[PDB]
């Protein structure tokens, strides 16, 4: 009954792993928009040249 | 097989538990109370003064 | 226990089995021993026999 | 023989007694203390309320 109730050792530190996973996606989303900002800069300069 | 699972069954399997069990159902199936919920505890009351 | 109630140990043979069931249910059998604490011995001496008496049930019984 | 195990089977059988049991022991395993006695008699007494 102990057992049927309760846990898989690898899930639980798996989800514990997953935090850092979307810190990082994050982080990456943040770069692209840094990107598009960049983009956006050099197009309004590029009319004014 | 977890080592939770394993450490129960150490646990479980030890001497002290075990042997504790064996002993105080032996008596609780000996007196047979119709409320063995106070006589456990009498009983274990009366087995910790040692 | 199925054992026990025959007074075998759990090594017995078939003819150590055979004796046991002959000896112990032409004690109890209710035409022969009167009455007493006779009602469910009988009963699990029949049980303990039936099971014990076929190979298929004996060993799956033995494995648990 | 058959009268005494009976009158022990008959009792142990019993749903009080087993599943007080039952739980006591899971309750113990989960638990793991050093000494099982006071435990149980702890156990048993907020136990007893209920």
Redesign the interface.
């Given at each position: 009954r102990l057992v049927s109730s309760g846990d898989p050792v690898m899930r639980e530190v798996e989800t514990a792993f997953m935090p850092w996973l979307k810190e990082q996606a994050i982080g990456y989303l943040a770069r692209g928009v840094v990107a598009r900002r960049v983009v956006d800069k050099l197009v309004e300069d590029a009319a004014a040249a | 097989q977890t080592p939770l699972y394993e450490k129960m069954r150490d646990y479980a399997h030890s001497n002290k538990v075990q042997e504790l069990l064996q002993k105080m159902t032996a008596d609780l199936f000996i007196e047979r109370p119709a409320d063995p919920v106070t006589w456990m505890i009498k009983w274990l009351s009366e087995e910790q003064k040692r | 226990d199925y054992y026990e109630?025959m007074g075998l140990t759990r090594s017995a043979n078939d003819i150590d089995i055979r004796r046991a069931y002959r000896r112990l249910a032409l004690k109890y059998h209710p035409d022969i021993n009167k009455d007493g604490?006779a009602?469910?011995?009988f009963l699990?001496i029949c049980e303990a026999y039936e099971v014990l008496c076929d190979p298929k049930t004996k060993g799956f019984y033995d494995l648990y």
């Open positions: - | - | 109630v604490a009602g469910d011995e699990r």
